[PDB]
Amino acid sequence: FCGKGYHLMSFPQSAPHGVVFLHVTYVPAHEKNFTTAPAICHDGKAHFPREGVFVSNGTHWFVTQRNFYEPQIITTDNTFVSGNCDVVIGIVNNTVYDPLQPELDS
Amino acid sequence: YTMSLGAENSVAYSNNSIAIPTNFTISVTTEILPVSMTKTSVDCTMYICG
Amino acid sequence: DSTECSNLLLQYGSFCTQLNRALTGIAVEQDKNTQEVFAQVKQIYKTPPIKDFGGFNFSQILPDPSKPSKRSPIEDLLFNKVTNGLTVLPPLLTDEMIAQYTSALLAGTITSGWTFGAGPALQIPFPMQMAYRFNGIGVTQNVLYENQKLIANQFNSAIGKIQDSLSSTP
Ligand SMILES: *[C@@H]1O[C@H](CO)[C@@H](O[C@@H]2O[C@H](CO)[C@@H](O)[C@H](O)[C@H]2NC(C)=O)[C@H](O)[C@H]1NC(C)=O
Ligand SMILES: *[C@@H]1O[C@H](CO)[C@@H](O[C@@H]2O[C@H](CO)[C@@H](O)[C@H](O)[C@H]2NC(C)=O)[C@H](O)[C@H]1NC(C)=O
Ligand SMILES: *[C@@H]1O[C@H](CO)[C@@H](O[C@@H]2O[C@H](CO)[C@@H](O)[C@H](O)[C@H]2NC(C)=O)[C@H](O)[C@H]1NC(C)=O
Ligand SMILES: *[C@@H]1O[C@H](CO)[C@@H](O[C@@H]2O[C@H](CO)[C@@H](O)[C@H](O)[C@H]2NC(C)=O)[C@H](O)[C@H]1NC(C)=O
Ligand SMILES: *[C@@H]1O[C@H](CO)[C@@H](O[C@@H]2O[C@H](CO)[C@@H](O)[C@H](O)[C@H]2NC(C)=O)[C@H](O)[C@H]1NC(C)=O
Ligand SMILES: *[C@@H]1O[C@H](CO)[C@@H](O)[C@H](O)[C@H]1NC(C)=O
């Protein structure tokens, strides 16, 4: 409706008997392949991203935002637990880091 | 000639692969929309008869 | 072919030119309408040969290779259910190319989500695309993943009911 791509903002310009809209939009570029999974199986529990998506570059698993590649360590802060690993089709095994775990150790 | 609809692209779909963008382009596009016309009035008596 | 009639018709001026120009404007407007509706993508996408979409069935909406018209069964049913100086100009886009455009749109929305409409086509598995759509309406991803088989069965049943309802209602 407001240009091709994900619309960011627009500018109006007067024209003789008309209006010209300058639509400023965001276009994704330089896409890269990753191996993806719906959920992470850890300790008999299924982990799902709160807002992102699980990606893998071949050896390591990360969670990133959907519209930009920004890999982060899969933790409990950005994932939520629902059910076990027996129901979700295509769940893979990976560790889930706990930020609280080094705190009580020391 | 018989016109081509578009360039042919085959999407590399599989059940466990995703494509994630690593960069972006800020694209500005133009959209021109007419708003009004010239306001014309015709004197019917003067046009037909003077 | 009466020359006297045309000689008398020349007294009325350029009425025929105005009628031809109005009909020409309508005729190009129809092609513009079809161009705006169907030609919204400049890349012709195709589905993969293996139809592994996590249990989701699109055979009723994807093009049938067995048919020479390369139409879907639903589109074939739709085409079957629709039945002196006069000329009919052919449309600029034939039915085969409009079917090809719809096939490209279907392949894009199945294999790439909504990403192809905003830029380059970014591939994503269909049970992940469905989860993204579930998150768009405010339902968590786990609900989609746990009940993926039931949702796929409901979707296939609904598509079959759509085909039956179109075939059974005049
Ligand atoms: C996937 O990405 C991770 C994160 O960058 C890579 O892990 C690092 O790899 C470099 C180079 O091999 C090492 O120097 C680092 O020590 C690694 N970090 C950790 C925490 O192990 C990983 O190698 C990448 N895998 C592939 C296949 O590209
Ligand atoms: C992911 O982890 C689970 C749990 O550790 C694995 O399930 C076990 O698989 C072994 C190998 O056949 C069985 O002997 C165990 O009985 C299984 N345990 C349970 C609780 O089911 C699973 O195989 C792992 N998957 C991968 C791909 O590594
Ligand atoms: C992701 O991987 C797929 C397949 O591994 C790539 O698709 C191939 O791309 C090359 C070059 O563009 C083509 O010659 C092949 O025909 C493609 N294969 C298929 C099955 O379509 C794809 O290019 C990769 N993504 C990126 C961004 O490079
Ligand atoms: C993302 O894209 C931008 C441009 O689209 C890249 O910026 C270019 O970077 C190269 C080398 O760093 C320069 O020679 C160009 O002049 C830059 N162009 C502009 C317009 O600034 C940027 O490097 C890309 N980033 C990544 C991570 O790929
Ligand atoms: C998708 O739906 C189609 C249509 O119902 C299925 O095709 C049927 O398959 C059965 C079993 O082979 C046949 O007895 C029917 O005659 C087929 N119907 C038609 C219209 O072809 C198809 O099996 C479903 N699944 C897949 C993976 O395509
Ligand atoms: C994905 O496909 C491969 C081969 O096509 C298959 O081995 C695997 O089980 C599939 N995974 C899921 C979750 O469907």
Side-chain angles (χ1 to χ4, degrees):
Chain A
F1 188 67
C2 311
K4 177 56 72 179
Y6 298 115
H7 171 237
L8 293 175
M9 65 184 292
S10 298
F11 297 119
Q13 294 288 272
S14 61
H17 298 300
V19 63
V20 174
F21 292 104
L22 303 193
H23 298 300
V24 188
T25 58
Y26 175 101
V27 176
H30 302 275
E31 54 268 9
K32 182 176 166 52
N33 280 338
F34 297 96
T35 302
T36 190
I40 294 299
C41 183
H42 179 64
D43 294 331
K45 295 183 291 293
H47 302 254
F48 306 89
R50 293 183 188 271
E51 64 183 0
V53 51
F54 296 134
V55 288
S56 168
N57 61 342
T59 55
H60 285 145
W61 282 97
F62 307 98
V63 62
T64 180
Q65 56 186 283
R66 307 162 178 187
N67 300 303
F68 186 78
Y69 184 50
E70 183 182 271
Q72 289 179 355
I73 303 298
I74 298 169
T75 66
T76 62
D77 299 359
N78 45 28
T79 56
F80 68 96
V81 172
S82 178
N84 47 7
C85 308
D86 293 331
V87 180
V88 178
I89 301 153
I91 187 166
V92 303
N93 290 351
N94 199 82
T95 190
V96 172
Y97 178 76
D98 206 305
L100 193 143
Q101 186 64 35
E103 311 311 303
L104 81 159
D105 186 25
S106 305
Chain B
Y1 50 89
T2 305
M3 43 158 175
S4 70
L5 295 195
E8 189 90 26
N9 184 28
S10 181
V11 180
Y13 178 83
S14 72
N15 63 346
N16 65 329
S17 176
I18 203 167
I20 306 294
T22 68
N23 209 334
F24 40 75
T25 301
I26 298 304
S27 169
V28 177
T29 58
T30 52
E31 175 162 25
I32 295 100
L33 284 174
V35 172
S36 54
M37 292 184 289
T38 296
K39 294 161 62 182
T40 71
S41 185
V42 175
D43 190 0
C44 175
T45 302
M46 174 152 176
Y47 173 75
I48 297 172
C49 294
Chain C
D1 55 324
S2 164
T3 184
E4 298 90 3
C5 185
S6 50
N7 288 343
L8 292 177
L9 185 53
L10 285 177
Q11 309 297 139
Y12 290 108
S14 64
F15 276 140
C16 284
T17 308
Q18 294 299 111
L19 301 164
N20 294 356
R21 184 181 294 129
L23 290 181
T24 303
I26 293 175
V28 304
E29 190 155 66
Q30 302 322 294
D31 291 328
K32 185 191 191 331
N33 285 345
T34 310
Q35 181 77 30
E36 293 294 329
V37 167
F38 289 103
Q40 295 209 5
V41 285
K42 299 288 97 176
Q43 311 282 304
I44 303 301
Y45 302 114
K46 294 190 295 293
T47 59
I50 304 302
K51 306 290 185 292
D52 194 299
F53 301 115
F56 288 86
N57 196 314
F58 306 106
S59 62
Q60 303 320 106
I61 62 176
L62 282 179
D64 204 334
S66 73
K67 304 297 184 182
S69 64
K70 300 296 186 292
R71 270 192 299 267
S72 86
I74 284 169
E75 282 175 328
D76 207 291
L77 197 148
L78 292 168
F79 271 74
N80 285 129
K81 283 209 78 65
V82 170
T83 57
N84 290 337
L86 294 175
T87 42
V88 168
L89 304 173
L92 178 57
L93 288 171
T94 64
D95 298 326
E96 292 84 3
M97 283 183 290
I98 296 167
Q100 184 158 234
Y101 268 132
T102 59
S103 78
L105 292 160
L106 282 154
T109 190
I110 281 162
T111 61
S112 75
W114 57 79
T115 65
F116 80 107
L122 320 170
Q123 76 233 21
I124 173 170
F126 194 79
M128 297 204 65
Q129 175 180 359
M130 195 49 75
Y132 279 24
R133 297 180 181 275
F134 263 54
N135 278 183
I137 58 156
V139 182
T140 59
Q141 282 186 335
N142 69 272
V143 174
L144 187 272
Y145 291 134
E146 289 156 357
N147 308 321
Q148 173 187 337
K149 182 66 182 295
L150 169 66
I151 293 169
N153 287 343
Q154 282 181 2
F155 171 75
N156 298 347
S157 299
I159 287 290
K161 281 175 242 152
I162 283 306
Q163 189 152 7
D164 292 352
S165 174
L166 286 173
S167 179
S168 65
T169 304

